[PDB]
């Protein structure tokens, strides 16, 4: 069934879905420092307390990275979901800008550190509350535009 | 046989897929050494400058290089194993660079933050091993995206 | 937390239509995943009726393509089924299932199911 | 495309190992399903991609096979293990199931 016009849906929701799991990726990055990196080089081991003003900083780089390769994302199918994370990330980003007082100084403490980036433990008052729904606003646009390469597919095989 | 062209599409897209999240994790660390070393949050700007205090986002950088290896390792293909192993040495190259090099990598000067994780610079000493693995992973990045492209190509044909 | 409930009347006369509404909750049909009916007769096996995607791409099965039909209302966040013309071969256990890519990304397959009910052809 | 599953009965004690065979009739790569059915409630999906376990089975159950002939084995077989079992074909619609297999407990 118009196999020739099928290839290039399968080629373009495939764009789509890329892009998105690269947003997907930055995410997990964020994650990783969260879990593996807050207050913690050395011989073995690949504990250091109460000084992670360094690593903030480089996880609101992701997160403004994060934003430019939304604005990047165009199509017209998933519109209503990359807006969804668009105004998602936008929160996030504006959050940890928008209170210095704890994050933009050289000590931040593992219990802020923990804070603003880690969405783990039990305190999210500033920071990892806003990186919640945003991880979760790409799982909507992930979902989706997995879906849409699947039918893009499933045209090939229908009777 | 239109079935065994679909299966060979999706399980191309599934290794272009895990191989550009390797690809993004690196994004990553190229974004914060150009963007975040030595600096701190900022109102209006969003960063500032902050020398010498580096200690923990080479750190962090660190906890990525290991989940890069991690997924370099969970990488199965047959077709790709030979880009797959020169990323897999590649990353652990790097990963025991870091480790290495633990006497001057708290508070990392720029000076030696930029050597150590950023790509744009003349010493990269303790760097040039995240140009081995990035483009190793390049060469791994295109590969699979003719391998995808491939597939397709057999759709139309006569 | 993904639930779906058929209803509708259990009984049709011959050469009536069928009728059934598949309520779903925990999730939401217009979101995505696609949303199938699936028929059991007594003693037998079991076979796909129709499916819909929220995009509005519905197949049917061609056994049936000529007497089936299905709708969606995504304010109620349900979809329907009628079947016309049905004959005692119509009698079974009725089913609306979601189906899932689950960890890959081709084919769906059916994940969720309703507690079916019994709808019964006869004078 | 046809999906013929055998045997249609299978009769083993707890503790014993049961394979089932879904022959298909023209090729399915490996879009194949297997299900479990206990009497009144709805089938229950155990595996997909013709050998993936979904959340929740049980290691016991294992599936495998290729464009024609699919095989599902319960090592092991427990007392929860006796239903019915269908496969299905996931690569077009009308997503062919089989007629079927229904194993009960020995004694």
């Known amino acids: 069934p118009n196999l020739t016009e099928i290839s290039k849906k399968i080629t373009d929701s495939n764009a789509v879905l890329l892009a998105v799991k690269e947003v997907e990726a930055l995410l997990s990055s964020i994650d990783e420092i969260a879990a593996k990196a807050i207050g913690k080089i050395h011989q073995n081991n690949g504990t250091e307390n109460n000084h992670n003003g360094s690593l903030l900083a480089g996880a609101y780089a992701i997160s403004t990275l994060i934003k430019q390769k939304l604005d990047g994302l165009k199509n017209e199918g998933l519109k209503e979901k990359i807006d969804a994370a668009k105004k998602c990330s936008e929160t996030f980003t504006n959050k940890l800008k928008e209170k210095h007082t704890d994050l933009g100084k050289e000590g931040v403490t593992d219990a802020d550190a923990k804070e603003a980036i880690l969405k783990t433990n039990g305190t999210k008052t500033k920071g990892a509350e806003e990186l919640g729904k945003l991880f979760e606003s790409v799982e909507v646009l992930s979902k989706a535009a997995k879906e849409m390469l699947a039918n893009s597919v499933k045209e090939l095989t229908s009777p | 046989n239109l079935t065994e062209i679909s299966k060979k599409i999706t399980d191309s897209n599934a290794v272009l897929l895990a191989v550009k999240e390797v690809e993004a994790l690196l994004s990553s660390i190229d974004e914060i050494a150009a963007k975040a070393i030595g600096k701190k949050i900022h109102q209006n700007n969003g960063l500032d400058t902050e020398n010498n205090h580096n200690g923990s986002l080479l750190a962090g950088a660190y906890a990525i290089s290991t989940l890069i290896k991690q997924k370099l390792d969970g990488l199965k293909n047959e077709g790709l194993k030979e880009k797959i192993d020169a990323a897999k040495k590649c990353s652990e190259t790097f990963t025991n660079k870091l480790k290495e090099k633990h006497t001057d990598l708290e508070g990392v000067t720029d000076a030696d933050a930029k050597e150590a994780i950023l790509k744009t610079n003349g010493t990269k000493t303790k760097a040039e091993e995240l140009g081995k693995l990035f483009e190793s992973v390049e060469v791994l990045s295109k590969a699979a995206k003719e391998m995808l492209a491939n597939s397709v190509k057999e759709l139309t044909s006569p | 937390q993904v639930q779906l409930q058929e209803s509708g009347p259990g009984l049709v006369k011959p050469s009536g239509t069928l009728s059934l509404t598949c309520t779903v909750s925990?999730?939401?049909?217009?979101?995505?995943?696609?949303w199938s009916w699936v028929r059991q007769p007594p003693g037998k096996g079991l076979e796909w009726i129709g499916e819909?995607?929220?995009?509005?791409?519905?197949n049917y099965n061609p056994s049936l393509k000529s007497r089936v039909t299905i709708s969606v209302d995504k304010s109620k966040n349900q979809f329907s089924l009628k079947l016309s013309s049905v004959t005692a071969a119509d009698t079974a256990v009725y089913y609306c299932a979601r189906s899932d890519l689950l960890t890959g990304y081709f084919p769906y397959y059916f994940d969720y199911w309703g507690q079916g009910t019994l709808v019964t052809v006869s004078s | 495309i046809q999906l013929t599953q055998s045997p249609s009965f299978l009769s083993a004690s707890v503790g014993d190992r049961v394979t089932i065979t879904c022959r298909a009739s023209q090729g399915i790569s490996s879009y194949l399903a297997w299900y479990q059915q206990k009497p009144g409630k709805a089938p229950k999906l155990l595996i997909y991609a013709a050998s993936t376990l979904q959340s929740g089975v049980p290691s016991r159950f294992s599936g495998s096979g290729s464009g024609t002939e699919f095989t599902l084995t319960i090592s092991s077989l427990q007392p929860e293990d006796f239903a019915t079992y269908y496969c299905?074909?996931?690569?077009?619609?009308?997503?062919?199931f089989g007629q079927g297999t229904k194993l009960e407990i020995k004694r």
């Open positions: 819909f995607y929220h995009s509005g791409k519905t």
């Open positions: 299905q074909r996931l690569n077009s619609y009308p997503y062919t």
């Open positions: 925990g999730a939401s049909i217009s979101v995505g995943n696609w």
